[PDB]
Amino acid sequence: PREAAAHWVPFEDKANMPDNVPDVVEVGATSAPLLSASYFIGAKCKPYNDDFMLCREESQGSGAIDCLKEGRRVTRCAVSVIEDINKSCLDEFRLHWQCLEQNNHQLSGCRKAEALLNKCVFTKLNLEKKIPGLRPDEEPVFLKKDPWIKPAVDDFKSVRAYAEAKKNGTL
């Protein structure tokens, strides 16, 4: 909660989780893949994440040890989402998060690869990207045409792929 300052020393511990806790696959995705697939892991794994945080609320200060069984399932279902999005559109997912590698991981600077990825995942993985808390007669911001805030440099691969998807008629 507070930052380490004044000569902090990093240390690691070679040790293992005990016998009674089963093993769990951990997420190997990085900040641009994770920020890319954030909306789709939030769309598929809403009740599991909600179960985890609601358990952690109900057992106060228990915290760590007593809702471990449910933090298993949130990691498992998000790994399921990212495996499925790899096998579905590895190329356009890659186009998206390689765009997000530049521009400070700003989501504002990568709209034209984001449209391709959202179409490809809604077509095949059939998850939709939505923003809740947004009452009607308020346009969602990744749908609007001529935004005020445009990126400095459109990346070249996604402009070319966006024009090719115009020409194919899939868009």
Partner 1 sequence: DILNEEAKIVQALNNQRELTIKMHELKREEKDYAHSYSPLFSDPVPQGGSIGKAPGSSR
Stretch that binds partner 1, among 57-65, 69-77, 137-145, 159-167 (CB under 8 A): 57-65
Burial zone of 77 (CB within 10 Å; 0-12 exposed, 13-18 middle, 19+ buried): middle
* Cβ distance to partner 1 smaller for residue 13 or 57: 57
Please pick, from the candidates 13, 57, 137, 146, the single residue that binds partner 1 as defined by CB under 8 A. Answer: 57
Q: Does 108 bind partner 1 (CB under 8 A)?
A: no
The string of DSSP letters for the chain reads -----SS-----------SSSPP-PPP---HHHHHHTHHHHHHHTHHHHHHHHHHHHHSTTTTTGGGHHHHHHHHHHHHHHHHHHHHHHHHHHHHHHHHHHTGGG-GGG-HHHHHHHHHHHHHHT------TT--SSS--GGG-SS-S---SS--HHHHHHHHHHHHHT--
* Cβ distance to partner 1 smaller for residue 42 or 151: 42
**Please, what is the minimum distance in Å from the beta carbon of residue 43 to partner 1?**
21
Binding residues among 36-55 for partner 1 as defined by CB under 8 A: 53-54
d(CA 134, CA 53): 23
Please pick, from the candidates 18, 22, 28, 61, the single residue that binds partner 1 as defined by CB under 8 A. Answer: 61
Q: Does 140 bind partner 1 (CB under 8 A)?
A: no
**Please, what is the minimum distance in Å from the beta carbon of residue 162 to partner 1?**
37
Size of the site for partner 1 (CB under 8 A): 9
Q: Does 68 bind partner 1 (CB under 8 A)?
A: no
**Please, what is the minimum distance in Å from the beta carbon of residue 84 to partner 1?**
29
**Please, what is the minimum distance in Å from the beta carbon of residue 60 to partner 1?**
4
* Interacting residues with partner 1 (CB under 8 A): 53-54, 56-57, 59-63
